[PDB]
Amino acid sequence: GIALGMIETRGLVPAIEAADAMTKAAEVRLVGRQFVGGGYVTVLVRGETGAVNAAVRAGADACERVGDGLVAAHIIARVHSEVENILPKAPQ
Amino acid sequence: GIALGMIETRGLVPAIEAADAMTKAAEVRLVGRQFVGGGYVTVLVRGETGAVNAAVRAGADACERVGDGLVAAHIIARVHSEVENILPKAPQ
Amino acid sequence: GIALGMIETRGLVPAIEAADAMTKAAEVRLVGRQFVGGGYVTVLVRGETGAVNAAVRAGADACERVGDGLVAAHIIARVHSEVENILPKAPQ
Amino acid sequence: GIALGMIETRGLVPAIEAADAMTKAAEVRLVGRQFVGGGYVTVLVRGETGAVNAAVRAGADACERVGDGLVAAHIIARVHSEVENILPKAPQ
């Protein structure tokens, strides 16, 4: 699948907990962990639209109160080919 | 797909109607019908997360007004391997 | 994907807008545009169950206030194999 | 891996949700899914005491609202040698 699901959190502890819930919840793949700076850490998951909706909801519910908290939880069913240039392909 | 949808009903007639409605609604393969006992019958399907959401909604509606009715409708976007041992593989 | 999402409109302008919004919103392939007659235009897409849900809602919302308006917005997660004989496979 | 954690639910759907949440939370092996009769389903898991406490918390929270509901969530850090003669060791 190609549907993109993003969860942004204040700190890394919320991000890792969110990523654990997302991957555990549905058939999504962790494709990147971005340090936006200023204590914003984003985790991006790609999968089918049904899977990503479940994965993102699990991540938001799991990290909502972990650490500093949750900033944003978004789902994009189809990203424009232009945006792919700025999305990580695999995490490091 | 590996998402799991389950519908629990009081009696077998609602369960058969649920299983029929779920399979016809979306791409969900029927995997088992377990007699829990005490009047409970459960029908389990497997499929993609998006398909299971549509199938379970249809099955819940189909068996709501049949006999004693519906008890539980649940979707699991991903099921751990250890739980596979307690899930029917093919209906018998 | 099997899931079928059809949007029917009065006149072509809403159909093109509905077709545009549907495809952009989610990962659905446009399979046919049909002139039913009497001003009806039907736009059909095929994709995943989750993708089709996202697309059809996007298409239905977009074309409501465009032109004569929207007639219907229908989703079929799985169509009986027989119905696939009368469905278009690529727009012409 | 000795500590025993049991969750009892009314129906099989809440039991399967409890088993999934219990197993996802921590390293606990699912030992049995017992149909008690009268609608009771009991899922027993075994593992280290720390993991079991985490597993049972996840199961009690996950299956509380699913279906008829949760009946009992119980942990025994060490069972008497006599009791193990009445505990399942492999789920059937």
């Binding site: 909706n53 994965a55 993102v56 949750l70 789902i75 | 379970v56 976007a77 | 996202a54 809602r57 | 609202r65």
Partner: peptide, 20 residues
């Protein structure tokens, strides 16, 4: 009615044009 991951996060998600 139908429990699952679709019921977990309420009002915290964005960008979902889910039907109905």
């Amino acid at each position: 009615r139908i429990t699952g991951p679709g019921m977990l996060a309420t009002g915290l998600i964005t960008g979902t044009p889910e039907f109905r």
